[PDB]
Design a protein around this ligand. Structure first.
Ligand SMILES: CCC(=O)SCCNC(=O)CCNC(=O)[C@H](O)C(C)(C)COP(=O)(O)OP(=O)(O)OC[C@H]1O[C@@H](n2cnc3c(N)ncnc32)[C@H](O)[C@@H]1OP(=O)(O)O
Ligand SMILES: Nc1ncnc2c1ncn2[C@@H]1O[C@H](COP(=O)(O)OP(=O)(O)OP(=O)(O)O)[C@@H](O)[C@H]1O
Ligand SMILES: *C(=O)CCCC[C@@H]1SC[C@@H]2NC(=O)N[C@@H]21
Ligand SMILES: [Mg+2]
Lengths: 247, 673, 261
């Protein structure tokens, strides 16, 4: 299986409007070697996908958001499911690949009473601790804290790319307009000017938060290349007996 | 392809798919700026990116995007277009489009409105043919208005009487009847179905020719009163009165019949004053008696195949004629060059109803363009999804050669080397049709698919030698996968000791039988003993390429591996048919004998809401029979709608929730069977 | 006449009064102390050393460039000090300036003090009172959060980290307390939730108030997020000093041994 294989079928898998959904497992199958993917916990907390695959014959760990199930939102179960998989992959020198399409954290009294804060911290900590190579690709959305929970550059990420349909924002364009232009209350033009500058990956790109805006069809050909370079990655951290996971 | 002559600078193509791609290609070959229309869904199709520029016409449905005349008019107005090509279908027969189009300076590339209105209706075409002193089906003249009239006419016009609703088309509104009671009941049924579908309410009743050959003559009329017949074609292989496999040089027909039919078609075209490309369909019986059926007044779909035996670009000649130039060819210049056979590859399941439309998204798509003598016409690229709004057809595959046998062999090779993954297609049907003994011999009628497979499409019944070849190939693939799994990079801390197993003793379960296989590996050679018979398999054993070529006992085979599980299940496409084989080791089979059967009943009758939210819409009601993949109740939740689907094929027992209702997580929404 | 010295004095007097006087009156009306009062209560008298006093936000969108939207300190007071003679780094979020919402400068100051603490090997105490993240600045604000979060994960098991929630805290400013070793809250004035009640009503369609969604009782009795709750800010800071006396300054140091009677 050549490492330079093109994947044109991913060039239009993301629907035009953010309202529709798509299957992330299709992207994962199109990207990995021979489309062979060993999914872990496939039936539990289905709004997140974790598994083992191969890139250029090297074992890799795949994490991603599933827009089909629960809109791709993060909750307690998905956070706990992802955190331990990431920790195991980091403990045994296995690279991590992340596909990001997440609108935010699931709200409600149930999530707060169950302690969504602790488990979201679990996932954030798991991604921040990793010293293995990590590659992130943002497909459609990254809003709120879920943006940097899902292996952002600011957690010592290695390479991050954005598809042309990426949407990186602090929070929803509307709610941002009313919270910023509260006195203006002229969303007719306020939203139009907001969706022209911030409803696009250009802000994070010009700040350098993403390395490059790549065509989807080159995804695999990029990732393999990165995994060939990052194989010698070594980082140093302050000494400690062990850290304090927020368990 | 002379570019010196002046021709229209701007052409708009009012179609989509393969035909739009073909017109764009032939316009680029002759130096014409092209315009392509497209709906919102098809905004990234092949013909849009191949065109110089494109104009969106409207929403997804064809009744609002490509059938919207006003959008086409404004698109032509803005783009300064000079000509328009309708391809086939859609507005190619629209008189209103023709008149509003001729209202301005732009010209319609095709036949005149007079021919369109003459041939749109069936009875007028039949009476014109009668006035054209050409052979026709003996049938009633006019429209039958009562069942009693139907039966009294059926007394004399023949016991095997066919009733056809006037106008319309597409294979509907046609039905065969035997008895007078059959005559009257078919009359009434045709009446209400024509009212519902066509709305014309006019019925044409005529004799049904038994076991006919659907021959077709391609004519190229011009503006100077010249008609040329471009040989013949055969479309006998039909499904629901829709053609699937075609052959340009018809073997049953001979030179004298060819000349007679060509002269008849030319005379009919001159009578109708046709001034573009078209086709005439005849039903040749056993005794070489043909009768006029329909003269298609547009670019016929099966046009490319005759090109392979003539060498003339039909679209180019249509454009040149529309300009006004005289025909550059003579009747004597037309001849037969080699052989050409083509098949239409649809996105349908051939196992059910001989092909029923399916939907999906194409994850993998590759055509055998590298194979010799193969032409592929397709508006399909990887990532293209098959929808319900349009014709569920993938591509058209044409093979040309010196003679019939070479063309059929190349067609079989091309079908074996065709990669489609994402939807279900009818490649198995086409390959079995081309390799059928009757098809090779030459005994074909319009009932080929019906009589050859009476109980339905079942798959390629493979013989003993073919079964041994398949088992050997599957076992060799299994052993190759194991050997690849044994290969690791050097560790230098815990060295790997590769096992020295020489013989692999496998149990291969196929269909229902179980076979014992002994496989041995020597380099790239696999010596496989299946039930005593010894075979040798050699290949490069590339486990990642979608197409794998092997050589079993000298015979070269091309197979695909569409699925593979660690349990032992494997789906392999061999000779066009997908076979499921379960491969285990002998010890694994002996231990599996103890395993108990797992009964799988499940529930799949309770639907749970993923989160609290407002159900945007519900498309089901209690008592709706639904299957897997169909959305049940789309729920809007936090600027995102989830189209939740049923787990199994069961009738909807109850829809507890309704549209515009707010629910919590895991509430009672839908109960199924 | 040199305007540099008078400018320095004016900027100092503006920093000590935060983002205004009527805002401070409103803060005290709700029973809440200001950030500098909290720092003064927490640390030993005459031991606070402030850092990044004049650091300013650099956003220039939606009118943030106007001097009316320019406040020295930028809604956070960071520095070092001593509790019972032992060194500790501290930051207090000033709700007066833009609701205490995070920005580039805010996160930079917090990250600077955290880096200094991990360099010398001293604990970090953070008094959280932040309405959220400055949304006019945009994506950069998120980066701030993430930077802070990274340092938390880097400091876990190296230096003790304590968080005291003394006001509303929503959005991404709920994960820094979660990543720290211990979290305390003040009753009836502190809130911890990812999304406010209005969003919950819009999405889940259930009407709740702030107190029952993220209040101290909720997070100390049925959520397991907070460790203790205190009646008011004075008692909370006294108990924080008492608790701080227990811990070692770093994982390299042994357990503190006192004099016993
Ligand atoms: C899609 C629908 C949406 O946009 S809802 C989610 C985002 N919209 C918001 O309003 C969230 C921020 N508003 C909030 O009230 C905060 O979440 C919380 C933590 C609850 C603050 O509680 P509370 O003590 O009642 O503040 P308040 O409303 O009385 O106003 C006081 C000052 O605080 C400020 N503040 C607060 N958060 C931010 C923020 N993220 N960015 C900028 N400023 C913030 C407010 O501007 C307000 O300023 P001022 O003193 O009224 O001039
Ligand atoms: N009089 C007839 N006797 C026997 N078979 C007939 C007769 N008329 C039609 N058929 C059968 O029906 C098939 C389709 O008929 P026909 O071409 O009229 O349909 P259609 O849907 O209008 O087609 P098209 O797309 O060419 O307009 C023919 O190929 C032939 O097999
Ligand atoms: C779109 O309407 C999303 C609304 C949910 C808000 C999410 S939740 C977590 C993030 N924190 C925040 O304040 N907004 C984001
Ligand atoms: Mg017809």
């Amino acid at each position: 299986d050549p490492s330079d294989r093109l994947v044109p079928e991913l060039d239009t898998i993301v629907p035009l409007e953010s309202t529709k959904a798509y299957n992330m497992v299709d992207i994962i199958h199109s990207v990995v070697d021979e489309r062979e993917f060993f999914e872990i916990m496939p039936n539990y907390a289905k709004n997140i996908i974790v598994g083992f695959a191969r890139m250029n014959g090297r074992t890799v760990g795949i994490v991603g958001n599933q827009p089909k199930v629960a809109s791709g939102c993060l909750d307690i179960n998905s956070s706990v499911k992802g955190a331990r998989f990431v920790r195991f992959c980091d403990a045994f020198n296995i690279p991590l690949i992340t596909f990001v399409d997440v609108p935010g954290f699931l709200p409600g009294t149930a999530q707060e009473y169950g302690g969504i804060i602790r488990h979201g911290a679990k996932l954030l900590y798991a991604f921040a601790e990793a010293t293995v190579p990590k590659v992130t690709v943002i497909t459609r959305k990254a809003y709120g804290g879920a943006y940097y929970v899902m292996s952002s550059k600011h957690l010592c990420g290695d390479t991050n790319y954005a598809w042309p349909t990426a949407e990186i924002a602090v929070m929803g364009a509307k709610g941002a307009v009313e919270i910023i232009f509260k006195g203006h209350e002229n969303v007719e033009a306020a939203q139009a000017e907001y969706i022209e500058k911030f409803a696009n990956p250009f802000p994070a790109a010009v700040r350098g938060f993403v390395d490059d805006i790549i065509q989807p069809s080159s995804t695999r050909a990029r990732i393999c290349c990165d995994l060939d370079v990052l194989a010698s990655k070594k980082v140093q951290r302050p000494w400690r007996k062990h850290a304090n996971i927020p368990l | 392809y002379d570019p010196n002559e002046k021709t229209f600078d701007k052409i708009l193509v009012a179609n989509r798919g393969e035909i739009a791609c073909r017109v764009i290609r032939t316009c680029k070959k002759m130096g014409i700026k092209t315009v392509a229309i497209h709906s919102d869904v098809d905004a990234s199709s092949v013909h849009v990116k191949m065109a110089d520029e494109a104009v969106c016409v409207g929403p997804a449905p064809t009744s609002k995007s490509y059938l919207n005349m006003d959008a086409i008019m404004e698109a032509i107005k803005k783009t300064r277009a000079q000509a328009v090509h309708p391809g086939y279908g859609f507005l190619s027969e629209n008189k209103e489009f023709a008149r509003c189009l001729a209202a301005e300076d732009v010209v319609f590339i095709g036949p005149d409105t007079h021919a369109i209105q003459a041939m749109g209706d069936k009875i007028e075409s039949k009476l014109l043919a009668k006035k054209a002193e050409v052979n026709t089906i003996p049938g009633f003249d006019g429209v039958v208005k009562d069942a009693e009239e139907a039966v009294r006419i059926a007394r004399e016009i023949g016991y095997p009487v066919m009733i056809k609703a006037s106008a319309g088309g597409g294979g509907k509104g046609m039905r065969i009847a035997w008895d007078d009671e059959e005559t009257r009941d078919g009359f009434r049924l045709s009446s209400q179905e024509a009212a519902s579908s066509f709305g014309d309410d006019r019925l044409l009743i005529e004799k049904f020719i038994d076991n006919p050959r659907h021959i077709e003559i391609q004519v190229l009329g011009d503006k100077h009163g010249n008609a040329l017949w471009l040989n013949e074609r055969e479309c006998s292989i039909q499904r629901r009165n829709q053609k699937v496999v075609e052959e340009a040089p018809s073997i049953f027909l001979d030179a004298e019949t060819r000349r007679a039919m060509g002269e008849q078609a030319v005379a009919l075209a001159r009578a109708v004053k046709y001034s573009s490309a078209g086709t005439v369909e005849f039903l040749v019986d056993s005794k070489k008696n043909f009768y006029f059926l329909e003269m298609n007044t547009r670019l016929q779909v099966e046009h490319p195949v005759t090109e392979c035996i003539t060498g003339l670009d039909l679209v180019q000649e249509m454009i040149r004629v529309a300009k006004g130039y005289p025909l550059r060819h003579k009747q004597a210049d037309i001849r037969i060059n080699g052989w050409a056979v083509e098949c239409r590859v649809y996105a349908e399941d051939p196992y059910k109803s001989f092909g029923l439309p399916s939907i999906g998204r194409l994850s993998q798509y590759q055509e055998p363009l590298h194979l010799p003598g193969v032409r592929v016409d397709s508006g399909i690229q990887p990532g293209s999804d098959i929808s319900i709004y349009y014709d569920p057809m993938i591509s058209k595959l044409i093979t040309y050669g010196s003679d019939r046998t070479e063309a059929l062999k190349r067609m079989a090779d091309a079908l074996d080397n065709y990669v489609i993954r994402g939807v279900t297609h009818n490649i198995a049907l086409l390959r079995e049709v081309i390799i059928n003994s009757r098809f090779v011999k030459g005994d074909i009628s319009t009932k080929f698919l019906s009589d050859v497979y009476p109980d339905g499409f079942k798959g390629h019944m493979l013989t003993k030698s073919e079964k041994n070849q398949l088992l050997a190939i599957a076992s060799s693939l299994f052993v190759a996968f194991q050997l690849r799994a044994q290969h690791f990079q050097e560790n230098s801390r815990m060295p790997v000791i590769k096992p020295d197993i020489a013989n692999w003793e496998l149990s291969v379960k196929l269909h229902d039988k179980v076979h014992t296989v002994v496989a041995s590996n020597n380099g790239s050679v696999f010596s496989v003993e299946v039930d005593g018979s010894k075979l040798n398999v050699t290949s490069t054993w590339n486990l990642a390429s979608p197409l794998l070529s092997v050589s079993v006992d000298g015979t070269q085979r091309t197979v695909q591996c569409l699925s593979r599980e660690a349990g032992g299940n494997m789906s392999i496409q061999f000779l066009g048919t997908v076979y499921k084989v379960n491969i285990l080791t002998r010890l694994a089979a002996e231990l599996n004998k103890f395993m108990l059967e797992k009964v799988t009943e499940d529930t799949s009758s309770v639907l749970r809401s993923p989160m609290p939210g407002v159900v945007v819409a519900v498309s089901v009601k209690p008592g709706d029979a639904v299957a897997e993949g169909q959305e049940i109740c789309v729920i809007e939740a936090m600027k995102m709608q989830n189209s939740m689907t049923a787990g199994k094929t069961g009738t909807v027992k109850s829809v507890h929730c309704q549209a515009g209702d707010t629910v919590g997580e895991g509430d009672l929404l839908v109960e199924l069977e | 006449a040199t305007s540099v010295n008078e400018r320095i004095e004016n900027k100092r007097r503006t920093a000590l009064l935060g983002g205004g006087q009527r805002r401070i009156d409103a803060q005290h009306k709700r029973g809440k102390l200001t950030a500098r009062e909290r720092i003064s209560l927490l640390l030993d008298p005459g031991s606070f050393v402030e850092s990044d006093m004049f650091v300013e936000h650099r956003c220039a969108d939606f009118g943030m460039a106007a001097d009316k939207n320019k406040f020295p300190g930028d809604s956070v007071v960071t520095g070092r000090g001593r509790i019972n003679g032992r060194l500790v780094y501290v930051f207090s979020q000033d709700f007066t300036v833009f609701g205490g919402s995070l920005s580039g400068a805010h996160a930079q100051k917090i990250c600077k003090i955290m880096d200094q603490a991990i360099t010398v090997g001293a604990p970090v105490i953070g008094l959280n009172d932040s309405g959220g993240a400055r949304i006019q600045e945009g994506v950069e604000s998120l980066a701030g959060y993430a930077d802070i979060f990274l340092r938390n994960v880097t400091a876990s098991g190296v230096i003790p980290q304590i968080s005291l929630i003394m006001g509303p805290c929503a959005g991404g400013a709920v994960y820094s307390p979660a990543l720290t070793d211990f979290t305390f809250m003040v009753k009836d004035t502190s809130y911890l939730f990812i999304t406010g009640p209005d969003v919950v009503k819009s999405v889940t369609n259930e009407d709740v108030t702030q107190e029952e969604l993220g209040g101290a009782k909720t997070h100390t009795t049925m959520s397991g997020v907070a460790h203790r709750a205190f009646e008011n800010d004075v008692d909370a800071l006294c108990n924080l000093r008492d608790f701080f006396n227990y811990l070692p300054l770093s994982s390299q140091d042994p357990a503190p041994v006192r004099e016993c009677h």
